[PDB]
Structure 1
Amino acid sequence: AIASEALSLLSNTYVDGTEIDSSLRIRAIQQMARNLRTVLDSFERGTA
């Protein structure tokens, strides 16, 4: 799953020019990549 306020940061709505906002958007992208990689390994375990 992807949270609210993490989907609001991926989809570039409420984009401010601040760096304290890009610092959060990067934090969201990293979590989404983590979760997608884990979900993909789950399919290799499920086969066994």
Structure 2
Amino acid sequence: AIASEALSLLSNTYVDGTEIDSSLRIRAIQQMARNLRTVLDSFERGTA
């Protein structure tokens, strides 16, 4: 699960090239993509 007001940006991105691209673009996308990778590893692993 991913909580709302964080998926608020993932539903759609009204940001049209925000001047500060390191503020809420990194510390959110990377933090969640870690688990978006671990869930792939889940099925990659459960076979053995």
Query: What interval of TM-score do these two structures reach, taking the shorter chain for normalisation?
Result: 0.5 to 0.7
Q: CA deviation at 1:8?
A: 1.1
What's the RMSD between the two structures over aligned residues? 2.8
- The structure whose residues are more often helix, as a share, is 1
Distance 2:5 2:21 in 1: 12
Q: Which runs of 5+ in 1 are unaligned?
A: none
Distance 1:33 1:17 in 2: 21
Q: Which runs of 5+ in 2 are unaligned?
A: none
Deviations 1:1-48 (A, max 9, x none): 111111112234675997678612332211221111000011121001
User: Residue 10 and residue 33 in structure 1: after superposition, are their counterparts in 2 closer, same or farther (change >3 A)?
Assistant: same
Moved more, 16-25 or 38-47: 16-25
TM-score by length of 2: 0.61
